[PDB]
């Protein structure tokens, strides 16, 4: 990479970002970080570095730079954008493979990334509730709650299959405690009603059948 | 080949320790904490001792405690084995 | 691997809405914690494949 | 006093506000005569400024300060045994990384820290030099030119003070070595620090296992040669006299299990005191107290030595903690494996009492799954409630796919290639796929396999296979016929006692015979099948399609996987054709191998191998000849040629076709090596053997071919005796054998020397 | 594969030569298996018209003073049967005062064998490996060991008389020495920078001294910090150190009189009012008696693993690793001659006494020079 006055290098960096090619743009943004680090427009350089990291699948450097920006600038006037960027960086990290196309569902892997994304988008939608990122954020939240509840339903399935009948009660009770309004729990109450019968505790099977029958079909 | 245990633990001596009218947390002092509870509003507790090793069938000592809104014990039920 | 671009791009994914669970007469639902509550919101931003993510 | 204005000269990259809020004096406040000493101390404590030059008067606080430059690139070269990444971690731990201001002084400390890291890896004569390159806007390029020098080796591992043993025996169990020849893979001559601290416990466990109780290591010593190459290791000991175990005694909060615990700690009187018996007893009391339902049982064991009659008294003190329950198992780290895979390897079920060893059994099973690089167990506490415990298994995975390759040489297989691809997590679901291909002198075998090791959740496994097989019999010293076959197998398998494994499956096969030379025993079966060609020329063909049914049993109780010394292995494989095909036969084969020791250290073993086989056709159709039995050559009875005992073919000679009844009984005697030094004499197995074999036909008739030797009489037992060696070389497994046929019959071959280099093919 | 990866550190080739002399190997007698590739101090010894050697397998020869034939040969191994032969590991010094040589070992033994027909007089056990030079002082064989136990044995019985316990670090660069006698005062090099001086009779430590500078984190400066061999001149004693200071100590006090920052693990010689030593980097210099100002600093043999100097006929003779003696003069330091001797090398001390030089090789071969 050659050296110039920095305005022309920022100009060709924006030119490389404009055409959709990213692998060259990250080098020029790093050159802006190196040759003139504390220049008068390093904020747009850092935010475009975040955008290039996200659009070119370089997720750990994206996490490092986004925690660096949340350390250095606590009250930037566009902190909602970098909050939304950390939210998308968490949620796009959840797939990280090619399994969505071949035909296998991914709702059985590590669920900690969706939990971190929920912890981000909660602060986003409850901190800056009149920004230009909220309406997509609530949709990502309502997808992520269902994706999180499918994990607990799909471990209660396995413990029904194994025969650890106290564990399915102690998991479906947690599912009814924490996600009381999703789609997975209304498909998980037959597991609890079948699980209470194999312990001969018939004083609660009528209760679970009442809470199923008072609802609709699905 | 499997081996599974399920539920709380009893000793067939701790069941001779609780009294009709025992205050709160003293059944938690002797029997230990409950592992599965009834969450739907009625303040009561369960105790299961399920174990089935080595293709021998199941066995169980299902114990049921029903409490008061205050915290004093009200009623017990000690099933020795499943029907 | 290099198939991270599918979720790396703005590929839209939508699912079913949430319905509050009913309650039969004679009992009560378990008390909810509230760690995963979704507040009511207004306004209309863009949705997937229509939202700019270029910083200003 | 106040200063009117502060002049700063030379601040370019750092901010004026940064320099003003760094030091406690600001632009024009109440000041003192400390600002000279402050500007000495403040700009030299942040690590950003080379030099200061100050002056103070009634008008201007005038400072000239240049800035320390910022690193642009930390580059390395010449790092042979070390890579750049952990060098970067050593630099970031040393204090200087990217985005830091150097001071042009501490580069000697960085070279010293690189010297300490090279001492930690085991290279002593290293020398590194830092190269500084200037660049404008206060930048430095940093280069580290290396000269690593020479690695270290261990000359001798000497032990002084031992009387009742020998110094060339205790080195055989050592992790370290001193000599390694050019025909063994016993280890390496490299030295490491913690290997010594792990090996002193191996020496202590050797001495605490044969009746020595007052044994006490005094001092260890590690010296090195003045040319910085050789390392001399010397450890002192002080051997005590032998001892015996007199009586035991228990005490503690035993939870009403005196008669329960007394039947375990009781042994017979008057035995040699051990170090494995006491620890196995301790762990057994731990396991029994866990199996009743206790969570964390503590058990201590102290001896008291009575040297007046060479006895010892063993006190054991139990301690039963209060019980614990598992409320939530949780897996954090599995990036691509399904959660239903990692929960069938947990012998602690959620919602039960906490077994302190069952978590460790789950950790060992997760290690044995082979998909994972490392696992990490832990234990937390749910707040508020005193006796509810979570358990977290963190995992870090591995690139699951592979690429294996192998060569081998034999005396009746020629060269042999084994190649293929094997994948053990197909998309991370538990399945295992593989494409395999083997080639030797005669048999070419190309198979594809797809298996699921958990059909249900109780260990039942299912597998499927598609296989192609080329058999050119003229290379394998038989009467010539060319057999090309292909088929599919679908099998089950499920364990029944964690030792005995059962299996059952179906299979379709298609066989094509051509280029088949005429004879009598093939053509009787060809008459019985009906399709009779003419006897004249070598041009013929036959096709067949079979539906099959396979069943099998496997008993495998051996004390090791390599060089066993105790136990048995019995395999039983049976095949029946089901009605719906051309051929109607059934075959049963049996393999028993028994290892029995007679000594105490398990170094004088008697080995037995029996190998039995029967088969026959049904309904009048004779059993086909391409499933015949062959016995002889490097596997059953050493000394003869490959596959050459039994009846002989009649052209219309002295060649073999096999038969349909096989009995082989071999007796081996394992002895220690008599010539090699005892430092590594446990990696070469020497044996003598006496072998019997017989293969005989049943459906032969003697009345119609009475000018020929009878083949329906299993009386011509072939006997042999020989000497075999077996070890591991850098080329792979090696087995050598020299036999001598001393009871053979008319029409057999002799091959006195016989060996197998590499893989078994 | 291992050659192309592991790099060569440093070397220097053979210099040229203008002979002025012809060294002729007169003896040329082998002893057996040889000391092998193990660093030790196993050098031959001269006694009354007789030479003695060793083998590090258990063999000890006995030869002439001018011919080179045996006069008695004794093995010291412990043979049990036709299928085994356990080595005895003779790796001490070789010395003789009272008609019976003393040979150290590695199995904590000190054999004592007579002159005429070699048999064992006594045999006892010390606290560890005994790799040092045995040395006599009014009787009282004074063995230094590798556990810091300066043990003392008597003459006709082989009994431990007293024992002084020194200190020891983790890493040592062959911590061993040889005691030196001065009026019943034994000065002894230690193992961690401490020169000691005890009484001969019962073992009272009179004083100690530290003469090696330590400026490391116990793994650079004390990566190795060991002294090798003191020697005594009138009043003042001199001692070396590895990576440290050549100093000079008074006998009663041990005060640091004058230093030179140097380093060695080999012997030296204090004949006349000069001192001739050998650096770690084989820079054979020559210093004054008290000043320490360098007289000459001829160093062409850098990183060649020299052994020791001697004083054969007004000339220093050093060893090498390639079997070459490198005869030098004294007043200038320039070379005199060179001589091919063996294709094995030397790690043992050349021994020059009674107008005779002789040297063992690394293969168990004894040579003498003119």
Author numbering:
A (entry chain D): 27 to 244
B (entry chain E): 29 to 111
C (entry chain C): 30 to 85
D (entry chain A): 24 to 675, 702 to 810
E (entry chain B): 22 to 391
Sentences reproduced from the published study:
The folding and membrane insertion of OMPs is catalysed by the essential β-barrel assembly machinery (BAM)2–4 which in E. coli comprises five proteins (BamABCDE). The major conserved subunit, BamA, is a 16-stranded Omp85 family member that contains five N-terminal polypeptide transport-associated (POTRA) domains that extend into the periplasm to scaffold four lipoproteins BamB–E5–8, all of which are required for maximally efficient OMP folding. BAM exists in an ensemble of conformations, with one of the most notable differences between published structures occurring around the seam or ‘lateral gate’ involving β-strands 1 (β1) and 16 (β16) in the BamA barrel. The POTRA domains are also dynamic, with motions of POTRA-5 also occurring alongside changes in gate conformation, with POTRA-5 plugging the entrance to the BamA β-barrel lumen in the lateral-open structures, but moving aside when the lateral gate is closed.
By contrast, the BAM-LL variant, (BamA E435C/S665C)19 is expected to lock eL1 to eL6, and stabilise a lateral-closed conformation. The BAM-LL and BAM-P5L variants were made in a BAM construct in which the two Cys of BamA that naturally form a disulfide bond (C690 and C700), are replaced with Ser (Cys-free BAM). To understand the molecular basis of inhibition, we determined the structure of BAM-LL in DDM detergent micelles using cryoEM. We predicted, based on the lethality of this mutation and the crystal/cryoEM structures of BAM in its different conformational states, that the formation of a disulfide bond between C435 and C665 would trap BAM in a lateral-closed state. However, 3D classification of cryoEM data of this construct revealed two distinct, approximately equally populated, structures. The first structure (at 4.1 Å resolution) is similar to the crystal structure of intact BAM in the lateral-closed conformation, with pairing of β1 and β16 and displacement of POTRA-5 from beneath the barrel. In contrast to WT BAM8, density was poorly resolved for much of eL6 probably as a result of higher mobility due to the removal of the natural disulfide bond between C690 and C700. We do not believe this to be a major issue since removal of the eL6 disulfide bond did not affect activity in in vitro-folding assays. Overall, these data suggest that the LL disulfide biases the conformational ensemble toward a lateral-closed conformation, but cannot completely pull the conformational equilibrium over to that state, consistent with BAM adopting only the lateral-open state in DDM detergent. Despite the apparent incompatibility of BAM-LL’s disulfide bond and a lateral-open conformation, both open-like and closed structures are present in approximately equal populations in solution.
